[PDB]
């Protein structure tokens, strides 16, 4: 889902978990009750650690991403942070959707749509992701359980296929695609296959 304002995001997540890993519902901490301006990440952590309830939260203007926002939330003896993302039209969101393929994967699909004995074309075309802008895709591949570092290359965010060449027959390769949001971060979670040409 997407939100027209930070408040819309907040109120939605008072009733629907902000986390994919635990059930975390936002509640006000015990000034504005939840927007704390350019509060440093470390100070936010200290403040939230002194709250009684899991889900105690604030939103802050990020220092590392100027002009953008972060959501900080108490859960047990930890504080979790969520980067507030923007789409092409300024709407805010935290998590990418897609009603097909593998749940919680971005892109949601990764198929080998064509292959020769030494090459292949991977495709994530069937991902329903026009609402989720990608900066660039990063593709990595290498011998499964290999010694060497993986090979990597990138393609523009408009792409929905990628060529991998020079593969040796009978060798298992692990292929992973990361969908960039900007020039630093990818959307969770990447999609990955193992394939033997």
């Amino acid at each position: 889902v997407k939100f027209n304002s930070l408040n819309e995001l907040v109120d939605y997540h008072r009733s629907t978990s902000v986390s994919r890993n635990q059930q975390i519902f936002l509640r006000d901490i015990g000034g504005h009750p939840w927007y704390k301006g350019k509060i440093p990440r470390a100070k936010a952590e200290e403040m939230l650690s002194k709250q009684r309830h899991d889900g105690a939260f604030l939103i802050r203007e990020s220092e590392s991403a100027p002009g953008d926002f972060s959501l900080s939330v108490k859960f047990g003896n930890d504080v979790q942070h969520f980067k507030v993302l923007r789409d092409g039209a300024g709407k805010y969101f935290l998590w990418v959707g897609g009603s097909g393929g593998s749940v919680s994967s971005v892109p949601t699909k990764l198929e080998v749509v064509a292959a020769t004995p030494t090459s292949l074309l991977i495709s994530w075309d069937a991902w329903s992701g026009s609402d989720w802008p990608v900066s660039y895709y990063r593709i990595t591949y290498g011998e499964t359980g290999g010694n060497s570092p993986v090979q990597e290359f990138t393609v523009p965010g408009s792409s929905y296929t990628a060529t991998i060449s020079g593969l040796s027959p009978g060798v298992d390769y692990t292929i992973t695609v990361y969908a960039g949001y900007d020039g630093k971060y990818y959307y969770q979670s990447p999609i990955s296959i193992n394939y033997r040409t």
């Binding site: 986390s19 942070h81 969520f82 993302l85 935290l94 971060y185 990818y186 959307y187 969770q188």
Partner: peptide, 8 residues
């Protein structure tokens, strides 16, 4: 660093 994004 954040729960919903990873570092490239």
């Amino acid at each position: 660093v954040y729960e919903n994004v990873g570092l490239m």
